[PDB]
Design an enzyme around this catalytic site. Sequence first.
Site, short mmCIF file in Angstrom:
data_model
loop_
_atom_site.label_atom_id
_atom_site.label_comp_id
_atom_site.label_asym_id
_atom_site.label_seq_id
_atom_site.Cartn_x
_atom_site.Cartn_y
_atom_site.Cartn_z
N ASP A 95 39.78 44.98 42.61
CA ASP A 95 39.00 43.82 42.99
C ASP A 95 39.21 43.37 44.43
O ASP A 95 40.15 42.65 44.76
CB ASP A 95 39.38 42.65 42.04
CG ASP A 95 38.43 41.46 42.26
OD1 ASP A 95 37.50 41.61 43.12
OD2 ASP A 95 38.64 40.43 41.57
N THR A 96 38.28 43.77 45.31
CA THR A 96 38.34 43.36 46.73
C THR A 96 38.18 41.86 46.92
O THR A 96 38.50 41.37 48.02
CB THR A 96 37.28 44.08 47.56
OG1 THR A 96 35.93 43.82 47.04
CG2 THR A 96 37.48 45.59 47.48
N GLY A 97 37.61 41.18 45.91
CA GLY A 97 37.39 39.73 45.99
C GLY A 97 38.58 38.90 45.50
O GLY A 97 38.48 37.69 45.49
C1 LIG Z 1 36.50 40.81 30.52
C2 LIG Z 1 35.10 40.24 30.71
C3 LIG Z 1 35.14 38.72 30.35
C4 LIG Z 1 34.41 40.42 31.97
N1 LIG Z 1 33.29 40.03 32.41
C5 LIG Z 1 33.10 40.58 33.68
C6 LIG Z 1 31.80 40.16 34.39
N2 LIG Z 1 31.96 38.79 34.93
C7 LIG Z 1 31.85 37.58 34.09
C8 LIG Z 1 32.23 38.64 36.25
O1 LIG Z 1 32.24 39.68 37.00
N3 LIG Z 1 32.43 37.42 36.80
C9 LIG Z 1 32.72 37.39 38.28
C10 LIG Z 1 34.16 36.95 38.48
O2 LIG Z 1 34.61 35.81 38.54
N4 LIG Z 1 34.95 38.03 38.56
C11 LIG Z 1 36.40 38.02 38.69
C12 LIG Z 1 37.05 38.84 37.53
C13 LIG Z 1 36.86 38.19 36.18
C14 LIG Z 1 35.78 38.54 35.39
C15 LIG Z 1 35.59 37.99 34.13
C16 LIG Z 1 36.52 37.07 33.65
C17 LIG Z 1 37.59 36.68 34.46
C18 LIG Z 1 37.75 37.24 35.72
C19 LIG Z 1 36.91 38.61 39.98
C20 LIG Z 1 36.27 38.08 41.25
O3 LIG Z 1 36.56 39.03 42.33
C21 LIG Z 1 36.69 36.66 41.64
C22 LIG Z 1 35.85 36.21 42.85
C23 LIG Z 1 36.16 34.84 43.38
C24 LIG Z 1 36.71 34.74 44.65
C25 LIG Z 1 37.09 33.51 45.09
C26 LIG Z 1 36.78 32.36 44.39
C27 LIG Z 1 36.14 32.43 43.17
C28 LIG Z 1 35.86 33.69 42.68
N5 LIG Z 1 38.11 36.66 42.00
C29 LIG Z 1 38.94 35.95 41.22
O4 LIG Z 1 38.78 35.70 40.06
O5 LIG Z 1 40.00 35.47 41.91
C30 LIG Z 1 39.64 35.12 43.24
C31 LIG Z 1 40.63 34.35 44.07
C32 LIG Z 1 40.51 33.10 44.61
N6 LIG Z 1 40.70 32.81 45.97
C33 LIG Z 1 41.02 33.91 46.55
S1 LIG Z 1 41.06 35.25 45.47
C34 LIG Z 1 31.61 36.85 39.18
C35 LIG Z 1 30.28 36.55 38.45
C36 LIG Z 1 32.01 35.84 40.19
C37 LIG Z 1 34.11 41.42 34.09
S2 LIG Z 1 35.32 41.52 32.89
#
Ligand SMILES: CC(C)c1nc(CN(C)C(=O)N[C@H](C(=O)N[C@@H](Cc2ccccc2)C[C@H](O)[C@H](Cc2ccccc2)NC(=O)OCc2cncs2)C(C)C)cs1
Lengths: 99, 99
Positions: free
Chosen positions: A25-27
Amino acid sequence: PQITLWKRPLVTIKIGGQLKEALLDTGADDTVIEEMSLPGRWKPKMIGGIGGFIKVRQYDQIIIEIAGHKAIGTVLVGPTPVNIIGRNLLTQIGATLNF
Amino acid sequence: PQITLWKRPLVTIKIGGQLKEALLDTGADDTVIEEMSLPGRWKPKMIGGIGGFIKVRQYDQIIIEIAGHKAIGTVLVGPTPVNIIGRNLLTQIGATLNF
Ligand SMILES: CC(C)c1nc(CN(C)C(=O)N[C@H](C(=O)N[C@@H](Cc2ccccc2)C[C@H](O)[C@H](Cc2ccccc2)NC(=O)OCc2cncs2)C(C)C)cs1
Ligand code: NA
Ligand code: NA
């Protein structure tokens, strides 16, 4: 290796003597791992994602292998639905984004 | 370009004709932009991550430029903490992870 982004970039990791799947995760600034009983001392922390903050335990100098590449650094343990490998470890394995 | 990960991978985007900064985010399925006025039709949706869910406006087939590269696809608009370019548009610009 090269990982395309048509699907979630999930790889196998080894941490604490256990194999797990985790998202490259680059984000993510930091690395967040699902609840696991790692040994030794830790520090309370709160980290924020898209919907708000959660509580995690910060463990330092944790050995983790990511897709066969050894790394060592801080890992945050708490109730996440997905293991996230963030930039603190992605840099150690020499990962880039390319287009 | 090749982008390393010692700093957050922020780039400039153009959306609705306006420049913004956004994070190239391989751990995001979707693209989420802060509240803004955007031309196009939208429908309510919810999206989640760490911390839980937020309400967003789902805009389909929106033209966006990401670091000078064109994409046309779905953009979620709402109270995200940071502007996020997720895999739905990273695939369009041909981005891959490499290590
Ligand atoms: C297991 C299942 C529930 C999953 N669903 C997914 C699909 N989903 C919902 C997502 O991709 N959702 C995304 C997300 O938040 N992804 C996340 C992984 C994730 C996914 C699902 C459940 C929990 C965590 C991963 C993303 O890189 C986010 C992006 C971000 C960055 C800064 C501020 C806010 C957000 N990063 C973080 O969660 O931490 C970021 C940190 C904050 N400040 C600096 S880094 C986006 C829509 C923003 C993957 S796994
Ligand atoms: Na795997
Ligand atoms: Na900040």
